[PDB]
Amino acid sequence: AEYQNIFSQVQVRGPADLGMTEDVNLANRSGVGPFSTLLGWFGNAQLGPIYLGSLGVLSLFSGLMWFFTIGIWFWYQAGWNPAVFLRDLFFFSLEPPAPEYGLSFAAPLKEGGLWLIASFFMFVAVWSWWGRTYLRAQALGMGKHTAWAFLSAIWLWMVLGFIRPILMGSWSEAVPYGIFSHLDWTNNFSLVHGNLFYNPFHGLSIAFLYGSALLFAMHGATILAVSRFGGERELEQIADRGTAAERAALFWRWTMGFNATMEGIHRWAIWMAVLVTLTGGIGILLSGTVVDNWYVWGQNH
Amino acid sequence: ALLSFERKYRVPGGTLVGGNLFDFWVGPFYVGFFGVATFFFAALGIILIAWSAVLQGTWNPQLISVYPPALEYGLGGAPLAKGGLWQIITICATGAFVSWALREVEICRKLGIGYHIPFAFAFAILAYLTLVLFRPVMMGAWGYAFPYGIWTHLDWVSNTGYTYGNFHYNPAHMIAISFFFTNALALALHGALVLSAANPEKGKEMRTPDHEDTFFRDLVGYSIGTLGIHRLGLLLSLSAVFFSALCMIITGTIWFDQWVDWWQWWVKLPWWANIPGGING
Amino acid sequence: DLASLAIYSFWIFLAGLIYYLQTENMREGYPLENEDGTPAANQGPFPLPKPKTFILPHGRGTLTVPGPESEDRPIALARTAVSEGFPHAPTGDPMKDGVGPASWVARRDLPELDGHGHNKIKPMKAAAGFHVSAGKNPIGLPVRGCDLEIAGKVVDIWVDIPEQMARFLEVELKDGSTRLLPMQMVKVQSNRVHVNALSSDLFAGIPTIKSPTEVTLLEEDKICGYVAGGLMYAAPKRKSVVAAML
């Protein structure tokens, strides 16, 4: 019938691409990994190379340590028994210091201290990776757009596990490391703050989360609809507009009265998605510090 | 009013219904048979919402709320002010949405492009229709659907959620959330990558795809490519809505209790089921 | 109350951001024109952004947007009604004249370059080390048009080297010359490549490339424009779903 260009018909492969050099310290780049024919049906088949400077090494070490602190506690909670570990994996939880400890680091290892060490490791890992998104762009002379977008995601994480606890005077206010328990905490947080559906910023965050899936459904579909004119080669279409960019713009103008440009739709994209965690972060930061009950706040409004 | 390059595309043809009769534009908007069908269904649905507002005794945006037929009616008709009006507005809504998708198909036909956007929109229409048609019919009553009101549909989400405990424990809801979160992540990243290359450090030459691939290769050791990221985006957002629709159409039809209890099937598995320790022993 | 100040400030910001984003998306296509090229009186509530300039690599110049419209080629379409808002009909052959779904834009008549300043798309013959790694290899298959008549045979795959993907199939015609068919417009089957957009008789009219070893963005746009235009204009010769699944 027609070809929808969702999965490739024929794969083609050539010599591994080592990348652009620009000001990247090449000594810090690994070799090429394998090529996967599976991935190649949907995207590029090549795996690697990866850059691993000192910052990449620190991020991986602290992140593996974050995983290890959580892992060892889970194994302890499982009585070191493999079968118990596997049946209750989603049920285990590394919990914060109890309220009485406030913000001190004097909590016993099994009762808060292990959580503190895990949080330290995740803090270092995430901020190291943030530095790395900045510096890899810098070495290639690119704008710092990824690092700034990553800062919005980091805002929510920072508010949830560090900034709002510190402002509230207690580590018990932060999230546990566990699959079901972080879900329980999320539910409990709404209950305690008088139903988060009345928080104006949670409503906005939701609007931007739904908005992100509306807009990537729209953008992805538009590009594959004009991939028959090389539409996915967006940077040359920005540099020298072709019929793919014109027909893409005119579908939406004829459908809903206004449209984007091949460069401009990526600004709508980064902002739609960034605003999810930006509004979300403000929403959580105000909860408990300024507003104790959002239903009540909603009444005086 | 046309864009600088638009005239050459405004040709005849592409209409699915009624030949050239509705083949024209009002300002930027294309009309077509499905353009007038969306205007009819949208207008009648809005007039019926205004009439439900009149009957409810309010004109306030925040307070207007059209409710489904209360459970006694099952899947039968209802008096207009007690659920009948919802039923008609639902017909109008389905009609306006399907017409919007079919209008998009006529615009695709005139522009010679693929039908990917109407196809993707159909998933959101099917999600709406799961909550309003498929799950109510499978459950035996229209009252299980949501109210058409800004704050009241949220009340519906909350009550429906809590009938099954913390709705987070629904496994298909978990998958749906994962796709929404990953979709927003990917969107941020794609926007950021095309923009970092098109707008390099001040004074440098515009970067190329190769630089996008090398940035992501240096950062995470893979680059899905420019075709792949758009393929991925469409798939993440569509899978998010599919699993949303799935998590609801199973709730109330084949699962009736607290969703947290589902997870016990894995715990009660014979070989580890009775070992003391952990969280469940 | 702090939360009250916060949400008020947010809506102010958001109004500002949407103004920025929409003006930003007016760098192409604006000013708006009436159906005869004159400036339209109603330009809407957003002004044109101040210019930005892209420095294009390897001696390709600069692009400053917003700017004067680059399209100056004749558009072969007659007005159909005196009133604004109606179709403009093809005066000649729409496929050949490059209008409607067969439109093309006068893009730069140089090949797209990779990051290293080399041609991005190359015939696989010349792309050293490139080979079909999975899927039915189309080279050698007959190419069948929508009228279910054979139009040629695939003599090569043109490859995007940096993305490692098939972009075009080079098809040899009955007179021995070749044409490029966009990969995303063909169906590679087990014994045939089928092109739904074009009947066999239309394959000779596909825009040609000048050099046997490279394609320019201008050529690509004319090839892709022509081929997609076939979905509307070749529809008389397109045999039914019935006729083809027999």
Ligand code: BCL
């Ligand atoms: C998906 C699960 C639930 C649900 C759960 C929630 C939750 C939870 C929240 C919302 C919120 C919203 N919901 Mg809801 N909502 C549902 C189904 C719908 C339907 C529908 C036809 O199916 C519609 C139109 C809406 C519409 C809305 C918006 C008014 C609001 C912001 C959403 C958004 O930005 O989307 C993204 C889309 C865009 C960015 C495109 C722009 C669309 C605009 C904003 C839609 C306006 C709708 C309009 C007022 C409806 C009347 C139409 C006619 C004029 C009569 N919901 C289903 C039943 N909805 C949020 C809120 O703040 O509510 C008070 C919120 O927190």
Ligand code: BCL
């Ligand atoms: C009963 C529970 C409550 C509720 C309680 C909460 C609470 C509590 C919170 C939210 C939040 C959110 N809620 Mg809610 N919410 C409810 C009902 C809803 C409904 C609905 C009914 O349909 C919807 C659509 C939403 C939607 C949302 C989102 C808009 C928002 C989360 C954004 C996000 O992307 O975070 C995901 C993004 C992150 C978590 C950022 C992560 C970034 C870091 C840096 C990643 C580190 C990774 C790490 C190192 C490990 C991996 C590395 C490997 C190499 C892979 N809620 C009900 C009423 N909701 C959050 C919010 O922002 O508030 C507004 C929030 O805190």
Ligand code: BCL
């Ligand atoms: C307290 C309540 C429970 C809970 C109860 C429910 C319930 C109940 C439902 C969900 C649903 C959802 N929940 Mg939940 N959920 C909870 C907590 C969460 C959290 C969180 C972080 O805590 C998250 C991330 C989520 C996430 C999700 C999403 C996966 C899903 C909503 C998207 C969707 O269906 O889109 C689908 C998209 C649509 C329905 C939109 C259709 C739009 C139509 C086609 C067009 C509209 C056009 C418009 C009228 C035109 C406007 C014109 C204007 C002029 C612009 N939930 C809590 C624990 N959740 C919903 C679901 O799965 O739905 C199927 C659902 O019903």
Ligand SMILES: CC[C@H]1c2cc3[nH]c4c(c3C)C(=O)[C@H](C(=O)OC)c4c3nc(cc4[nH]c(cc(n2)[C@@H]1C)c(C(C)=O)c4C)[C@@H](C)[C@@H]3CCC(=O)OC/C=C(\C)CCC[C@H](C)CCC[C@H](C)CCCC(C)C
């Ligand atoms: C399938 C995946 C995602 C997606 C995709 C998507 N949406 C799409 C498309 C796509 C690909 C379009 O092409 C189409 C579009 O043109 O976008 C600009 C659209 C669209 N997605 C929209 C909204 C939307 N999409 C949503 C979600 C999603 N859309 C998913 C996240 C949501 C929510 C809440 O998450 C909303 C609000 C519309 C803006 C637009 C379709 C426009 C359209 O069909 O409108 C014609 C209708 C009218 C002019 C008015 C009719 C009014 C009725 C008669 C009354 C209706 C009342 C209603 C039933 C209740 C309202 C009250 C609520 C508070 C409950």
Ligand SMILES: CCCCCCCCCCCC[N+](C)(C)[O-]
């Ligand atoms: C996410 C990667 C999973 C990809 C699996 C999909 C494989 C598609 C295989 C069909 C091969 C293409 N075809 C039919 C034209 O030969």
Ligand SMILES: CCCCCCCCCCCC[N+](C)(C)[O-]
């Ligand atoms: C408080 C958290 C800070 C998050 C703010 C993040 C803004 C990201 C903006 C993306 C657009 C800006 N820019 C320069 C990168 O293009």
Ligand SMILES: CCCCCCCCCCCC[N+](C)(C)[O-]
């Ligand atoms: C084997 C370890 C798997 C457990 C990983 C735990 C994921 C839940 C993470 C929630 C953490 C939230 N946070 C960062 C803000 O504290």
Ligand SMILES: CCCCCCCCCCCC[N+](C)(C)[O-]
């Ligand atoms: C940053 C994303 C903001 C999400 C809200 C989307 C608003 C779309 C507004 C359309 C305004 C453009 N306009 C006036 C020309 O139609």
Ligand SMILES: [Fe+2]
């Ligand atoms: Fe894009």
